[PDB]
Symmetry: C3
């Protein structure tokens, strides 16, 4: 029974889309999620929407633990998120989609495990594998769905997640390029890590909104530029989600989820 948690689900909380709507504030052993969980069906598939920043909060301080724990406890099998990001590559243009497959962690202040010694709900030490952080099957549906829509889309990409809330210096932007990063943001880590500990199939839709500050004869990133590009291109990620959702619903998952569950279980030392 597929149930899709959606974080950053641009415009999905709408009576024309979300049927049987219901809104639910929850508590978790890690605290309160960013906002109420919005429950309903989209194209006959059970979904749970969660707004990452609420509606106020810096990326460093988002309660990623509470957010993922809540989605797990609601019964989500899948999580699909959207994020804005900066492009670190010429061929990734503003407005393009990137179905990211890897990350580089540049965060510093963020808890990244549920298994923190302090919670009876998550006993022991968890060393979760991260060789493949993102759900391959969901990513493949995202890719094929983008092609069906005729959208500019990149099939793979490495996201460097910085601590923020400041944007990167130019020396930093250049060094990230040399480390192999393709796109840059402030939220992928530790969301992806925690979803993996929870045995959830997690994938990210990244939309490039600027070229950070590395580029020649190009204007550097600002809040205003991001906000304008998002406004011009949000419709893309929304169509992609909306078209992906029913395909997730009709796909077989038992083996995929069984392996995720085993991987998470055998990562824990008691």
């Amino acid at each position: 029974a597929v149930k899709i948690g959606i974080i950053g689900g641009t415009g999905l909380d709408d009576p024309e889309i979300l049927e049987g709507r219901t809104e639910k504030y929850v508590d978790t052993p890690f605290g309160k999620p960013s906002d109420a969980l919005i429950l309903g069906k989209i194209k006959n598939v059970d979904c749970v929407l969660l707004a990452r920043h609420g509606r106020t909060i810096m990326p460093s301080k988002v309660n990623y633990q509470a957010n993922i724990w809540a989605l797990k406890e609601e019964g989500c099998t899948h999580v699909i998120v959207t994020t804005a990001c900066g492009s670190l590559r010429e061929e990734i243009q503003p407005g393009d989609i990137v179905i990211i497959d890897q990350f580089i962690d540049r965060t510093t202040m963020r808890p990244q495990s549920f298994y923190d010694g302090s919670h009876s709900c998550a006993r022991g030490v968890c060393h979760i594998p991260m060789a493949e952080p993102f759900c391959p099957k969901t990513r493949e549906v995202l890719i094929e769905t983008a092609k069906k829509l005729g959208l500019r889309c990149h099939s793979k990409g490495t996201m460097v997640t910085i601590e923020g809330p400041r944007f990167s210096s130019r020396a930093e932007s250049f060094m990230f390029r040399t480390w192999g990063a393709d796109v840059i943001n402030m939220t992928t880590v530790p969301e992806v890590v925690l979803a993996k500990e929870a045995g959830i199939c997690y994938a990210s839709i990244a939309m490039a909104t600027d070229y950070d500050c590395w580029k020649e004869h190009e204007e550097a990133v600002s809040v205003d530029r991001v906000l304008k590009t998002l406004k011009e291109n949000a419709n893309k990620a929304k169509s992609l989600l909306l078209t992906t959702i029913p395909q997730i619903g009709s796909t077989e998952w038992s083996e995929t989820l069984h392996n995720l569950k085993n991987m998470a279980q055998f990562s824990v030392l008691l």
Copy 2:
């Protein structure tokens, strides 16, 4: 439009320089109309009292980063309180000095580096005023860092160093490490490959916060050692840094003393207006 014109003394309808690490400037021969003032901020107490006065007829505010008696690790300096206090005093500009390690052969111990970029290797440090917990700084601030250092100040610093005939480097990338330990040799080498030119423990987040405050910030970096990457050269130690600082402090002091009046006679309204705008348009609110 408006020209700032005078006629028979009358005009129709203001630089203040915060100085952090201001080597030897707290001296009656230099600082005229001295006054000393302990302050509170919404982010706590600054490292030390603010020393107020005029230097070559320009209003200045001196602040010791490690406090009087150099008692605090770079990780635990209250950068928020320091920058907020300088802002609240009315500083338009901040000029700091820092010691640093050289990562490049051509940056010799004793050389000045007018840095233009940084690489953050800190881990423990608040880097914004807009932290959700202060009514004085509401919302989320994503401040741009493409050009972290005030270009106009940097230019005056460069041209002033040339006038004095000092060995000086016009650009440079500072890697700021968390400390208080110095870098391993593997770290030192990797920093070189990332493009860092000098190394220290304080530039981040001082530079970031000044930018959020709409202050024109520049740094005078003085190389005191070659860190530990170098052949037929002895590695950094507290004692080597101290010795090199002592031999070379007169340089940064002259540089400042000669820069100060040039900042005072330069036009800033447009520069500060743009900084103010950049800071304002960085903040998100519902």
Copy 3:
């Protein structure tokens, strides 16, 4: 008077090895060590054994308390063993690496005793890290590995990640480009703190996997690490046991004097 603190001393707590055994729980100004200190003689050399995980995630190990306790017991030397991932083809699972450098990728960890909050450690300490690992110990380790005929690497850079998660593949690749050779979760800040304490510290790294960078190879997992450790723990144990008496017979007065001076002259008061 040589006294060897041993962290991760796989199988040394045994009546056939540790003579005059005694077990001692201690308090330090930085809290409780991971576990009791096990005191005794191994091949007539005074040792102190400490179990690093006592259960506890690497981020939350009390490295300060562990090193302080070993210092307070009089340890002149610390020799540790660590599992690690290999970032190089020629460092095979089961190999020993006598590491000589580190790259810090930790974020949450106190790395000094001189934290402003302890009268036992007043002021600011800027310890040098050009040579984080005791050269003389390392040389004995290398020569001893050769005598035993073990596969051993004379140098190596350890990247210490925060954990508890393993690295992504993008991370694994980038660590290679930075010059790291092996990967773990504990070397930093253990090595740093031992240096502040004036202790000659060296590390025996045993590769247990190839992390996740490699082709035609299966990625790291808790189960793979554990299996490889089980098959190869004997090697580090024989190496320690054979190193210990050579440390005992070596002259150290100048080496320790210089470490003591280096630590002392690092402190601003």
